[PDB]
Amino acid sequence: SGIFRDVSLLHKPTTQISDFHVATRFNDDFSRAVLEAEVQMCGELRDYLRVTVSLWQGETQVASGTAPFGGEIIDERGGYADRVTLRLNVENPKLWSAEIPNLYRAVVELHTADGTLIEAEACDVGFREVRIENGLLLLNGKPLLIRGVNRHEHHPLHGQVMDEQTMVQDILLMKQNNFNAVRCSHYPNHPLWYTLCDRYGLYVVDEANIETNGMVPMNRLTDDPRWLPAMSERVTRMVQRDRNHPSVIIWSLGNESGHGANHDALYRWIKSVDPSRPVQYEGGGADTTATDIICPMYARVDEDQPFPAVPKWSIKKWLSLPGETRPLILCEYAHAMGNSLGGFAKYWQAFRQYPRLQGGFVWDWVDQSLIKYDENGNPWSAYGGDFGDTPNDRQFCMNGLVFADRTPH
Amino acid sequence: DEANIETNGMVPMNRLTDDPRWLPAMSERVTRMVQRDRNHPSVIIWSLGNESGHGANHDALYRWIKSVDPSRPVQYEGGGADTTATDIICPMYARVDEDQPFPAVPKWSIKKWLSLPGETRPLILCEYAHAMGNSLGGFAKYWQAFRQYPRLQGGFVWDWVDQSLIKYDENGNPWSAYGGDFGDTPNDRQFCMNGLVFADRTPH
Ligand SMILES: [Mg+2]
Ligand SMILES: [Mg+2]
Numbered sequence: 001s002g003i004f005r006d007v008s009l010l011h012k013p014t015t016q017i018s019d020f021h022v023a024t025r026f027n028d029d030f031s032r033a034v035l036e037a038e039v040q041m042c043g044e045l046r047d048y049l050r051v052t053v054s055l056w057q058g059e060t061q062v063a064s065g066t067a068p069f070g071g072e073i074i075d076e077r078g079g080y081a082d083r084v085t086l087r088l089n090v091e092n093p094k095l096w097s098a099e100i101p102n103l104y105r106a107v108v109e110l111h112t113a114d115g116t117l118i119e120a121e122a123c124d125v126g127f128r129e130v131r132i133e134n135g136l137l138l139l140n141g142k143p144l145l146i147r148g149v150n151r152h153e154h155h156p157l158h159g160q161v162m163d164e165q166t167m168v169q170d171i172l173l174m175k176q177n178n179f180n181a182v183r184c185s186h187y188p189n190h191p192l193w194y195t196l197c198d199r200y201g202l203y204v205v206d207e208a209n210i211e212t213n214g215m216v217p218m219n220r221l222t223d224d225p226r227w228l229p230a231m232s233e234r235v236t237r238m239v240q241r242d243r244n245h246p247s248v249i250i251w252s253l254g255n256e257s258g259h260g261a262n263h264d265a266l267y268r269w270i271k272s273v274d275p276s277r278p279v280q281y282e283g284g285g286a287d288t289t290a291t292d293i294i295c296p297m298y299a300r301v302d303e304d305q306p307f308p309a310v311p312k313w314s315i316k317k318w319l320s321l322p323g324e325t326r327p328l329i330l331c332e333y334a335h336a337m338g339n340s341l342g343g344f345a346k347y348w349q350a351f352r353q354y355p356r357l358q359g360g361f362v363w364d365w366v367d368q369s370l371i372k373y374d375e376n377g378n379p380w381s382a383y384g385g386d387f388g389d390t391p392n393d394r395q396f397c398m399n400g401l402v403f404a405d406r407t408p409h
Numbered sequence: 410d411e412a413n414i415e416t417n418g419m420v421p422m423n424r425l426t427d428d429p430r431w432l433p434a435m436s437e438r439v440t441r442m443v444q445r446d447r448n449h450p451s452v453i454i455w456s457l458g459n460e461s462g463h464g465a466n467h468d469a470l471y472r473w474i475k476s477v478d479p480s481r482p483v484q485y486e487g488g489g490a491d492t493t494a495t496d497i498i499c500p501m502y503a504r505v506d507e508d509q510p511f512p513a514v515p516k517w518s519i520k521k522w523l524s525l526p527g528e529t530r531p532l533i534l535c536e537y538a539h540a541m542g543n544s545l546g547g548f549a550k551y552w553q554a555f556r557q558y559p560r561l562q563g564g565f566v567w568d569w570v571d572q573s574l575i576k577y578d579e580n581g582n583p584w585s586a587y588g589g590d591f592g593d594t595p596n597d598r599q600f601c602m603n604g605l606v607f608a609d610r611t612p613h
């Protein structure tokens with residue numbers, strides 16, 4: 001517990017940019033794109049206001065558009081007079097991927113038409129399209145193969161406080177070890193993480209901070225309408241904050257909360273508000289109506305585990321169950337606890353062999369061990385119960401490919 | 410029940426089946442079979458023939474059947490086993506786990522075939538586990554997969570009975586003959602004996 005992320009003070013003008021969303025759509029071969037940026041303002045709405053969105057590739061301005069406020073008519077009562085959408089055509093855009101994280105910079109200027117900049121906001125833009133078609137998850141029209149890992153925000157000395165150095169260190173090692181994707185198990189991350197995955201190039205699954213694993217049955221709260229509002233905020237505010245980051249390619253509804261009607265409602269909300277990214281969610285059996293991707297945790301390659309209600313079928317058999325057509329990407333596999341990863345190669349052979357087997361995210365990146373000091377004052381790695389904590393789950397907090405100080409296992 | 414149409418020896422295999430001048434002759438082999446056997450309950454699936462590639466004549470006949478007798482699915486393996494002329498993926502000799510990616514008509518592992526992008530049909534091998542000589546090695550492997558995968562619905566082993574013919578030696582004693590044993594040439598030697606049982610019905 002505590003104030004474990006940054007605290008800051010922001011000054012905004014009375015007439016200001018209150019939100020902005022950037023989308024990139026493409027022609028059939030990705031040789032042409034349209035960048036569309038919807039901008040909303042709060043404050044003093046007057047005819048002289050304008051929005052200029054300019055797109056830069058390095059120090060070169062590749063495109064720009066200026067428009068007064070007032071969006072298209074949307075219904076019988078009119079349109080959003082406090083919003084404007086700029087559309088910029090971009091030819092032969094440099095596409096973003098984890099392989100080549102090409103980025104442009106979009107600058108959003110709120111200003112008077114005669115030239116006074118009120119304020120400007122901006123973001124890195126990655127031209128990429130994410131879509132599932134014919135059962136496959138495609139990125140820029142090509143099917144991905146996710147070499148993913150789940151990563152908690154953990155530091156042996158600072159607990160859950162993240163810092164730039166540490167994040168960088170993890171992203172370098174991930175890449176140096178041929179990972180191309182990370183799942184935010186199981187909550188939105190510190191904001192700099194996204195900046196870094198955008199820039200270094202990692203595909204990201206951004207996950208709502210919703211986990212009710214300990215309930216009995218697990219969907220007791222998620223199927224309860226009285227918990228819809230609390231859950232809604234966790235999903236909606238995440239999307240509102242992270243929707244312009246190219247690194248985020250998939251949204252997840254949370255983790256181990258069973259399958260409740262709240263999930264269905266929220267799945268739909270995202271699909272309406274942000275059609276650019278698939279939505280996934282493993283609870284309730286990993287292939288529920290609340291997921292665009294079959295995203296089991298620990299389903300084996302050839303061996304079925306037919307538990308009642310939420311069986312974990314062999315991943316190869318799961319893809320072809322009668323009527324199933326979705327791609328399958330394990331949200332968690334290859335539990336790296338202690339001396340483990342036995343059978344890892346079996347997964348990779350299947351993934352390469354079956355098109356719709358598109359990978360998975362290893363559980364997990366770093367052991368959650370904490371440093372304790374002995375009588376002599378020498379540091380030692382502690383786990384569950386080492387702080388008097390009880391009940392506790394002992395060494396179950398250490399499941400990483402790397403030790404808490406980033407030394408590899 | 411399978412129409413008497415096989416043009417395996419053409420190059421390419423569908424040279425006649427894709428030619429409309431052969432549509433009439435092919436059509437009678439299909440339509441006349443259906444006219445004859447359509448009242449038999451034992452017939453559950455119609456087949457457009459065998460090893461004749463995939464030509465437009467197959468598509469035309471596939472629809473004819475679907476149109477006159479909606480009661481039984483239509484299958485046909487030619488052209489890759491999963492063409493538009495078949496309601497069932499029905500490969501011959503596709504393996505359980507191993508892919509055989511031949512160009513144009515690959516034979517995927519059956520487990521994988523089921524799940525190719527967009528595929529939804531059931532898969533029943535029209536021929537598998539070629540029982541020629543001392544064979545049937547790996548037969549359990551197919552059965553374990555058919556039981557584990559709902560859409561893997563079995564197959565037809567190749568084949569029931571050895572096609573050997575009886576010849577008689579000088580003393581008049583009979584012996585089992587195969588390709589070339591009658592002066593026939595060219596011939597394919599022992600490839601006519603692929604049965605689970607010998608010609609006389611004794612089991613292998
Ligand atoms: Mg305990
Ligand atoms: Mg010969």
Ligand code: NA
Pocket residue numbers: 145350351352353354355356357358359
């Ligand atoms: Na694959």
Ligand code: NA
Pocket residue numbers: 396397398399
């Ligand atoms: Na754990």
Ligand code: NA
Pocket residue numbers: 554555556557558559560561562563
């Ligand atoms: Na089966």
Ligand code: NA
Pocket residue numbers: 600601602603
């Ligand atoms: Na033969």
